[PDB]
């Protein structure tokens, strides 16, 4: 019967795997694992998670000039 500080996100298991390996890269990203589709992201870095996630998936995107 304890409490923590945290924020929830909803994602498919692919983006789950991305933020898992990002947690492996930078430790203070996620606190604990909820399902294959629910996470508990640290609220102080949720904007960092978005700003990193949208740039890493760009390598699957062809970007002509």
């Amino acid at each position: 019967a304890r409490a923590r500080k945290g924020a929830l996100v909803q994602c498919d298991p692919s983006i789950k795997a991305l933020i898992l390996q990002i947690d492996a890269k930078m430790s203070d990203i996620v606190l604990e694992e909820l399902d294959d589709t629910h996470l508990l992201v640290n609220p102080s870095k949720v904007e960092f998670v978005k700003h990193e996630l949208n740039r890493l998936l760009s390598k699957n995107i062809y970007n002509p000039m």
Binding site: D12, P13, S14, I15, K16, A17, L18, L20, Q21, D36, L57, K59, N60, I61, Y62
Partner: protein
């Protein structure tokens, strides 16, 4: 500028605001917009006087893209060379462009037309006695060129191997080389009695391509691109019959060589003693003074120690001045020593026939130095709407990668990542459902996957025959005959063997499980195997192209890179993130989690005579 103050909304146009061009009062009749920045021509097709402008633009400009409503053209140097070669003087082009454009033609575009159209036909490469000469009617043009001196009315002989260097150098200078064969006035080479059979009909777009080639009464060396099944072979036969000189045809496969010999013997009045084949099995030559030889690029361009008979045949080919060479699948010519076939063979006219004029490197632009300018771009959608080729429904099925496969996908090297995203079980389910659905529709389906292990695994899971490189040729022929005739065989799995020029039965559906990186040539080659289906005469018939790709992987990047060429042709790849009836199919490939786990483990575990009795 024309003393025009820029508007407040001119900021986001990086010196591309062309509002200073005063619009003409009768602009609504005119179908053209001319951009002074790059010579890009914007043509509206719905307006009146559009086709009367469209033929003018396809004669003088290269079509970047041809959608339904607005057509986009590029004025380039080679298009202007082709335009002036067919007899269009500069003043006529400028006046017709001025008449047909809403905005007035800028002086930059006019000066570009002046500069590119002038100094044309100065330097000419002529061949005399199997020996190259570069010739100029003006004396000082020989003396002004002094940087690349490979010298061996005013003319000087260059070396045979340095013809490409000379053409590149003279393209760098403002004196492009005129490569045209006046076969009517060429009496040194012995002629041929080859002519088209009267029972053979030629479609109007083939006539248009040949009129691009033979516009001025002289055979102009260049490239004609046509879709698979549109009759590029017939265009080759017809050009050979037009030139009526000795013809050498280079193919990429021996089966293509036999097909070309069959098409020459069938479509035109060429006697078999005038024809010859240079392959491994066949090496005897025609004994007449002129005729046809058909061979392979690798056979002519073999730097290895060839046999004595092959050396004799190659000496015969090199010692004979050929009047015409047909380079089928010209996209493989810019290779390392496939480039040398245009130098080892002294041919007056060089025609390149292909369906995929793309390469993943920058060497595709070297073909104008090798063969010649792009003579004719076939409009694929015009041919599809006229029933000449099949009306394919291109699609891109998105297969969501499973959790465990994606977890293994992130922590792996690229080579293992490749096989790991090919063999995802959602792609198995999507391919199985598509095979079942299109087999219920009575469609002949060809499934393409470059990974051999994935090809075998998909074929064994779905119970369909597979064809790849190490399969015996008699087994390949038997499986092809079963696919063509047996109604129980409606799906055959093919590796990269099917991408190259081999004979295939007609198919109306296609599934691309895997691919070779972002090969646009392979992507368009696979599409060509369903573009020539017999059911084109049926109203409402559509062929189907499916590119099964795994979500959130590099397969999206490579699939988009491959589909770039097809959307440049004008095809619309509609994504499919949902197939209606996936859960309702009876048998699903790897539906259970334990089956998917077993598949994951399997994919991970994939990666003195008497002394002679001694010996």
């Amino acid at each position: 500028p024309a003393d025009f103050v820029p508007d407040s909304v001119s900021g986001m146009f990086r010196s591309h605001d062309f509002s200073y061009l005063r619009l003409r009062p009768d602009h609504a009749s005119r179908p053209l917009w001319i951009s002074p920045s790059d010579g890009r021509i914007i043509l509206e097709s719905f307006s009146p006087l559009a086709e009367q402008a469209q033929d003018f633009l396809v004669t003088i400009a290269e079509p970047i893209s041809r959608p339904s409503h607005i057509h986009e053209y590029k004025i380039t140097a080679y298009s202007l060379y082709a335009a002036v070669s067919v007899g269009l003087e500069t003043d006529d082009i400028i006046s017709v462009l001025d008449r047909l454009s809403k905005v007035p033609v800028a002086e930059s575009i006019i000066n570009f037309i002046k500069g590119a159209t002038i100094s044309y036909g100065k330097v000419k490469l002529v061949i005399k006695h199997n020996r190259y000469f570069v010739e100029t009617t003006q004396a000082d043009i020989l003396q002004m060129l002094l940087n690349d001196s490979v010298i061996g009315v005013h003319s000087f002989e260059i070396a045979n191997e340095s013809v490409e260097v000379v053409k590149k150098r003279c393209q760098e200078i403002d004196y492009p080389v005129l490569e045209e064969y006046d076969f009517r006035n060429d009496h040194r080479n012995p002629d041929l009695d080859i002519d088209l059979k009267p029972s053979t009909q030629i479609r109007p777009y083939q006539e248009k391509s040949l009129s691009k080639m033979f516009g001025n009464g002289r055979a102009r060396s260049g490239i004609i691109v046509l879709p698979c099944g549109a009759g590029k072979t017939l265009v080759g036969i017809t050009a050979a019959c037009t030139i009526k000189k000795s013809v050498i045809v280079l193919c990429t496969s021996s089966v293509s060589v036999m097909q070309w010999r069959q098409q020459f013997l069938q479509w035109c009045t060429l006697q078999p003693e005038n024809c010859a084949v240079f392959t491994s099995d066949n090496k005897e030559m025609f004994q007449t003074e002129s005729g046809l030889v058909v061979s392979t690029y690798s056979m002519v361009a073999n730097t290895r120690n060839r046999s004595h008979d092959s050396q004799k045949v190659m000496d015969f080919l090199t010692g004979r001045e050929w009047g015409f060479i047909i380079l089928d699948e010209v996209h493989v010519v810019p290779a390392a020593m496939f480039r040398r076939v245009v130098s080892t063979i002294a041919a007056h006219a060089k025609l390149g026939l292909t369906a995929t004029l793309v390469r993943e490197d920058d060497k595709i632009g070297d073909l104008n130095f090798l063969i010649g300018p792009k003579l004719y771009e076939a409009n694929w959608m015009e041919l599809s709407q006229k029933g000449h080729i099949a009306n394919v429904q291109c699609a891109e099925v998105w297969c969501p990668m499973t959790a465990e496969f994606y977890q293994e996908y992130l922590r792996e090297t690229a080579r293992k990542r490749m096989l790991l995203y090919i063999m995802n079980p959602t792609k198995f389910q999507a391919c199985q459902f598509l095979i079942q659905y299109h087999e219920r529709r009575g469609d002949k389906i060809i499934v393409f996957s470059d990974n051999v292990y994935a090809l075998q695994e998909y074929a064994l899971k779905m119970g369909k025959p597979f064809i790849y490189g190490s399969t015996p040729q008699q087994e390949r022929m038997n499986i092809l005959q079963n696919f063509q005739y047996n109604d129980q065989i409606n799906t055959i799995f093919l590796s990269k063997v099917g991408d190259t020029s081999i004979d295939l039965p007609e198919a109306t559906c296609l599934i691309q499980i895997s691919s070779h990186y972002g090969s646009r040539r392979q992507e368009a080659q696979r599409l060509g195997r369903i573009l020539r289906a017999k059911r084109r005469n049926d109203e409402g018939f559509n062929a189907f192209f499916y590119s099964l790709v795994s979500k959130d992987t590099q397969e999206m990047y490579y699939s988009t890179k491959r589909q770039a060429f097809l959307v440049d042709q004008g095809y619309a790849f509609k994504v499919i993130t949902h197939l209606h009836g996936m859960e309702n199919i009876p048998n699903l490939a790897y539906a259970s989690p334990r089956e998917r786990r077993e598949l994951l483990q399997e994919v991970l575990l994939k990666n003195h005579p008497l002394i002679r009795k001694m010996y």
